[PDB]
Amino acid sequence: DVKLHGSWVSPFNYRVIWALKLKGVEFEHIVEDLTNKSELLLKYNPVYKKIPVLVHGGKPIAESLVILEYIEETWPENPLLPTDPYERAMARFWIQYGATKTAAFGALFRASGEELEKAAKEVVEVLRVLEEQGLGDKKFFGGDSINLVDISFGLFTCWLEAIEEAAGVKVLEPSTLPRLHAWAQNFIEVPLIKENIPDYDKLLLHMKGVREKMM
Amino acid sequence: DVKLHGSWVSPFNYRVIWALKLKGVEFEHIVEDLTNKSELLLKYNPVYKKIPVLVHGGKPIAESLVILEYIEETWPENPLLPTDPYERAMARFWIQYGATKTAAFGALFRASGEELEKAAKEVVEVLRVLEEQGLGDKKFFGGDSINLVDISFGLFTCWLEAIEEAAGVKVLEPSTLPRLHAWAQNFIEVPLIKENIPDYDKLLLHMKGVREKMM
Numbered sequence: 349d350v351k352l353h354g355s356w357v358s359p360f361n362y363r364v365i366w367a368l369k370l371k372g373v374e375f376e377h378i379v380e381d382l383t384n385k386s387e388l389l390l391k392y393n394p395v396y397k398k399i400p401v402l403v404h405g406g407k408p409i410a411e412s413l414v415i416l417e418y419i420e421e422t423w424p425e426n427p428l429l430p431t432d433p434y435e436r437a438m439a440r441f442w443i444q445y446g447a448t449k450t451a452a453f454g455a456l457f458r459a460s461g462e463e464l465e466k467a468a469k470e471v472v473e474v475l476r477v478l479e480e481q482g483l484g485d486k487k488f489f490g491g492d493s494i495n496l497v498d499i500s501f502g503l504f505t506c507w508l509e510a511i512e513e514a515a516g517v518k519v520l521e522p523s524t525l526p527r528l529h530a531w532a533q534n535f536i537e538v539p540l541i542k543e544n545i546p547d548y549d550k551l552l553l554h555m556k557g558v559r560e561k562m563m
Numbered sequence: 564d565v566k567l568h569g570s571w572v573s574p575f576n577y578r579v580i581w582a583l584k585l586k587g588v589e590f591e592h593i594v595e596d597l598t599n600k601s602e603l604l605l606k607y608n609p610v611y612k613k614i615p616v617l618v619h620g621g622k623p624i625a626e627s628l629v630i631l632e633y634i635e636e637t638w639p640e641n642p643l644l645p646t647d648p649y650e651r652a653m654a655r656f657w658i659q660y661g662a663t664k665t666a667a668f669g670a671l672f673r674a675s676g677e678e679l680e681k682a683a684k685e686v687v688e689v690l691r692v693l694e695e696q697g698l699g700d701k702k703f704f705g706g707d708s709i710n711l712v713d714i715s716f717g718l719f720t721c722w723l724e725a726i727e728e729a730a731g732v733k734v735l736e737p738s739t740l741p742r743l744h745a746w747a748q749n750f751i752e753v754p755l756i757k758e759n760i761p762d763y764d765k766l767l768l769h770m771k772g773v774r775e776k777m778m
């Protein structure tokens with residue numbers, strides 16, 4: 349009844365895997381080869397031709413952030429958003445902030461030397477705003493358990509770790525971002541996340557390849 | 564009880580004016596001078612330092628799309644989103660598509676000659692996808708009356724008209740985009756929109772100035 353056109357490396361696909369598993373929703377995972385996109389992928393997502401694409405009752409939902417809100421509204425038990433409208437607006441605000449700033453991480457795949465150091469310090473500033481104004485002293489962005497905001501920021505854990513290793517730069521460090529680094533460790537230790545993340549060696553090999561092709 | 568830090572020209576501010584007026588919410592409009600931002604603006608929106616900023620019960624909400632969803636959740640009567648989760652996901656999908664593609668309109672303020680013609684045809688393609696896959700044969704994106712999707716696309720009416728006149732290019736024409744052009748006329752004729760839009764001559768003079776400074 350639920351299908352997910354995905355991948356074993358895309359952080360955007362993993363957001364959807366986490367939300368479905370948090371809801372206890374049974375689904376078929378269909379791994380797409382992005383060099384040979386399926387007929388169903390192109391039919392279901394003609395606008396972007398990207399994964400993830402959730403298909404529920406034969407009807408498709410593309411874009412990870414749109415899919416997450418659909419899952420939250422369709423399976424409302426064990427909520428991943430707060431009930432208060434102001435708190436919900438803050439969650440949407442931070443999710444949107446991450447989506448706009450995710451482009452600044454692309455410079456870690458292209459820049460070198462004194463330019464890559466500049467890109468890394470700009471990423472640290474992006475993360476510091478998120479840490480200071482978004483996370484604060486909470487264990488998770490969701491408070492005492494993960495919510496859609498933690499899910500939207502999960503790419504700053506093993507995916508960012510792999511990018512740091514592939515590029516030879518440090519971004520999310522305990523000395524510079526103490527609370528955000530503790531959060532990244534706590535997020536990765538949540539059993540649902542621990543049991544549903546790509547193998548680090550494979551992810552690192554993928555990131556090295558992306559940096560290789562993007563110079 | 565409700566304050567809006569805004570402007571008399573920003574299309575993003577006008578999205579919020581429309582949603583508040585559709586809800587019958589009383590508000591104070593505080594027009595910001597963006598060359599001399601108020602103490603309250605900088606305190607309420609430290610992340611972007613932009614307008615609009617809604618302040619409700621002394622608590623601020625920045626980013627027009629975040630504000631629109633907050634207004635819809637806070638004042639749920641006379642809904643601006645559908646009830647069905649799949650239809651709500653489609654509305655969010657199209658709003659997101661507009662937000663990502665709004666950057667392609669920036670080239671109409673910078674490019675000239677055979678390059679500006681290229682930017683205009685790329686904008687027509689963006690609008691054609693919206694017309695064919697989003698609007699379809701409905702009178703409005705909201706069906707028989709305007710919703711958050713029409714509000715999010717309202718900048719493609721008099722704001723885009725002013726940009727076309729300032730740049731000397733044509734984008735939203737009846738021959739090329741028949742349904743979207745009829746929608747733009749119908750949107751502007753809705754009494755709530757008609758009574759709450761900037762004066763066209765002032766808006767055109769503003770767009771000419773933006774094109775002048777952005778070459």
Ligand SMILES: N[C@@H](CCC(=O)N[C@@H](CS)C(=O)NCC(=O)O)C(=O)O
Pocket residue numbers: 358359360382397398399400410411412413
């Ligand atoms: N904004 C999209 C981004 C998804 C995305 O970039 N997907 C990539 C995989 S990580 C993709 O499908 N790329 C298509 C390709 O490489 O042709 C979302 O959040 O779902």
Ligand SMILES: N[C@@H](CCC(=O)N[C@@H](CS)C(=O)NCC(=O)O)C(=O)O
Pocket residue numbers: 573574575597612613614615625626627628
């Ligand atoms: N993404 C924001 C965009 C708002 C925006 O760009 N605001 C402009 C006015 S149209 C602004 O405040 N600019 C600040 C400046 O010029 O310093 C939204 O949707 O609210």
